[PDB]
Design an enzyme around this catalytic site. Structure first.
Site, PDB file in Angstrom:
ATOM      1  N   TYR A  15    -111.262  34.119   0.429  1.00  0.00           N
ATOM      2  CA  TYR A  15    -112.104  33.542   1.471  1.00  0.00           C
ATOM      3  C   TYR A  15    -112.040  32.021   1.557  1.00  0.00           C
ATOM      4  O   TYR A  15    -112.633  31.428   2.459  1.00  0.00           O
ATOM      5  CB  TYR A  15    -113.551  34.005   1.288  1.00  0.00           C
ATOM      6  N   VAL A  17    -110.440  27.991  -0.504  1.00  0.00           N
ATOM      7  CA  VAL A  17    -110.035  27.187  -1.655  1.00  0.00           C
ATOM      8  C   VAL A  17    -111.231  26.709  -2.479  1.00  0.00           C
ATOM      9  O   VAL A  17    -112.343  26.584  -1.968  1.00  0.00           O
ATOM     10  CB  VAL A  17    -109.260  25.929  -1.213  1.00  0.00           C
ATOM     11  N   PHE A  78    -119.952  25.151 -12.476  1.00  0.00           N
ATOM     12  CA  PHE A  78    -118.567  25.108 -12.926  1.00  0.00           C
ATOM     13  C   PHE A  78    -118.381  25.753 -14.305  1.00  0.00           C
ATOM     14  O   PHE A  78    -119.201  25.546 -15.206  1.00  0.00           O
ATOM     15  CB  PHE A  78    -118.106  23.644 -12.983  1.00  0.00           C
ATOM     16  N   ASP A 123    -114.489  42.253  -3.807  1.00  0.00           N
ATOM     17  CA  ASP A 123    -113.190  41.641  -4.074  1.00  0.00           C
ATOM     18  C   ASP A 123    -113.052  41.127  -5.510  1.00  0.00           C
ATOM     19  O   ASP A 123    -112.549  40.032  -5.765  1.00  0.00           O
ATOM     20  CB  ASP A 123    -112.910  40.511  -3.067  1.00  0.00           C
ATOM     21  N   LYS A 125    -111.601  40.435  -9.076  1.00  0.00           N
ATOM     22  CA  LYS A 125    -110.256  40.270  -9.611  1.00  0.00           C
ATOM     23  C   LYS A 125    -110.390  39.286 -10.755  1.00  0.00           C
ATOM     24  O   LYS A 125    -111.408  38.596 -10.860  1.00  0.00           O
ATOM     25  CB  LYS A 125    -109.317  39.716  -8.534  1.00  0.00           C
ATOM     26  N   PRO A 126    -109.388  39.222 -11.643  1.00  0.00           N
ATOM     27  CA  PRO A 126    -109.413  38.307 -12.788  1.00  0.00           C
ATOM     28  C   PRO A 126    -109.719  36.861 -12.418  1.00  0.00           C
ATOM     29  O   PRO A 126    -110.385  36.167 -13.174  1.00  0.00           O
ATOM     30  CB  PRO A 126    -108.013  38.467 -13.386  1.00  0.00           C
ATOM     31  N   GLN A 127    -109.238  36.427 -11.254  1.00  0.00           N
ATOM     32  CA  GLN A 127    -109.463  35.052 -10.797  1.00  0.00           C
ATOM     33  C   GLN A 127    -110.924  34.763 -10.456  1.00  0.00           C
ATOM     34  O   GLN A 127    -111.326  33.595 -10.407  1.00  0.00           O
ATOM     35  CB  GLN A 127    -108.590  34.758  -9.565  1.00  0.00           C
ATOM     36  N   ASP A 141    -118.494  34.700  -6.567  1.00  0.00           N
ATOM     37  CA  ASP A 141    -118.184  35.089  -5.192  1.00  0.00           C
ATOM     38  C   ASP A 141    -118.663  36.445  -4.706  1.00  0.00           C
ATOM     39  O   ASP A 141    -118.010  37.073  -3.890  1.00  0.00           O
ATOM     40  CB  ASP A 141    -116.672  34.942  -4.966  1.00  0.00           C
TER      41      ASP A 141
HETATM   42  N1  LIG Z   1    -111.956  26.581 -13.314  1.00  0.00           N
HETATM   43  N2  LIG Z   1    -113.205  26.910 -12.803  1.00  0.00           N
HETATM   44  C1  LIG Z   1    -113.323  27.659 -11.705  1.00  0.00           C
HETATM   45  O1  LIG Z   1    -112.351  28.107 -11.086  1.00  0.00           O
HETATM   46  C2  LIG Z   1    -114.733  27.922 -11.260  1.00  0.00           C
HETATM   47  N3  LIG Z   1    -115.827  27.488 -11.853  1.00  0.00           N
HETATM   48  N4  LIG Z   1    -116.873  27.957 -11.124  1.00  0.00           N
HETATM   49  C3  LIG Z   1    -116.497  28.712 -10.027  1.00  0.00           C
HETATM   50  C4  LIG Z   1    -117.222  29.393  -8.998  1.00  0.00           C
HETATM   51  C5  LIG Z   1    -116.498  30.105  -7.989  1.00  0.00           C
HETATM   52  C6  LIG Z   1    -115.067  30.125  -8.017  1.00  0.00           C
HETATM   53  C7  LIG Z   1    -114.348  29.436  -9.054  1.00  0.00           C
HETATM   54  C8  LIG Z   1    -115.050  28.713 -10.085  1.00  0.00           C
END
Ligand SMILES: NNC(=O)c1n[nH]c2ccccc12
EC number: 2.7.11.22
Length: 286
Positions: A15, A17, A78, A123, A125-127, A141
């Site tokens: 969805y 970046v 984060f 959705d 996923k590992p990411q 997400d």
């Molecule tokens: N390297 N950190 C990240 O990728 C990350 N950290 N908080 C999020 C909240 C939503 C999507 C990614 C992230």
């Protein structure tokens, strides 16, 4: 916007970046997701805004939702690493079973929470799974899936979605999580399809082509074709070796074809696989 120094890009979600950014005023470090050569939709910031009220140790906190300059921004807490990077980093050795177990238990707690609040991810996923140095893992997400769909990753998509079902249920998240569980164990994606039909047939080749016996109503699904080849289900001890029987049993319940038979997150938490669960600290290289 100009409120941040925007330290660096850190990923592209289905969805939008994501950026690591430092609030140029409060010094707070956050993950900033920009929602957007395609188009810039809009419908319910109300929906997303409601998500700011979700608070659970295993859900990445959504701090703010900003609609401006024909763009939507979601500000998230984060976390330093995602599970995809951690798995890649742990590829030579493998993630210790106790840590895989801890992560699966925590993810199920997060899903049990979201699902009890009628919020689906859709959705996973590992990411989308984030980890910190203290052994926690959190889902990010949730509840975004409200629009069409790096090429999108189909690897974690439930069969009912691939067969064109219009109404999905919480079962789709359990399926995705089962796929991720398998991947942490074997160190290889379970169903790495490169197209929707390949994704579907990879599932069929492993779990057997579904029929009305195991999945009442499957032959009447939108994209079901009587012409699908009929593959016999694989042993299964061949699927996630060398996972023990409690783990295999739980995984098999997370991968049932019939979303109605697929185990719920709450029921999964009570599975015997978690009787000896602990909370190890991972070795994170940041
Ligand atoms: N390297 N950190 C990240 O990728 C990350 N950290 N908080 C999020 C909240 C939503 C999507 C990614 C992230």
């Amino acid at each position: 916007m100009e409120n941040f120094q925007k330290v660096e890009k850190i990923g592209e979600g289905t969805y939008g970046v994501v950026y690591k950014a430092r609030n140029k005023l409060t010094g707070e470090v956050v993950a900033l997701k920009k929602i957007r050569t395609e188009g810039v939709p809009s419908t319910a910031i109300r929906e997303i805004s409601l998500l700011k009220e979700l608070n659970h140790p295993n859900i990445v906190k959504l701090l703010d939702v900003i609609h401006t300059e024909n763009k939507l921004y979601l500000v998230f807490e984060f976390l330093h690493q995602d599970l995809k990077k951690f798995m890649d980093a742990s590829a030579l050795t493998g993630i210790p079973l106790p840590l895989i177990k801890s992560y699966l238990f925590q993810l199920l707690q997060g899903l049990a929470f979201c699902h009890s609040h009628r919020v689906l991810h859709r959705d996973l996923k590992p990411q989308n799974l984030l980890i910190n140095t203290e052994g926690a893992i959190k889902l990010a997400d949730f509840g975004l899936a409200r629009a069409f769909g790096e090429v999108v990753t189909l690897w974690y998509r439930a069969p009912e979605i691939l067969l064109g079902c219009k109404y999905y249920s919480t079962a789709v998240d359990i399926w995705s999580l089962g796929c991720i569980f398998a991947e942490m164990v074997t160190r290889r994606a379970l169903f790495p399809g490169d197209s929707e039909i390949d994704q579907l047939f990879r599932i069929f080749r492993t779990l057997g082509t579904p029929d009305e016996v195991v999945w009442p109503g499957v032959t009447s699904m939108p994209d079901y074709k009587p012409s699908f080849p009929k593959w016999a289900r694989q042993d299964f001890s061949k699927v996630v070796p060398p996972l023990d029987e409690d783990g295999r049993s739980l995984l098999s319940q997370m991968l049932h074809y019939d979303p109605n038979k697929r185990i719920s997150a709450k029921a999964a938490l009570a599975h015997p696989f978690f009787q000896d669960v602990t909370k190890p600290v991972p070795h994170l290289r940041l």
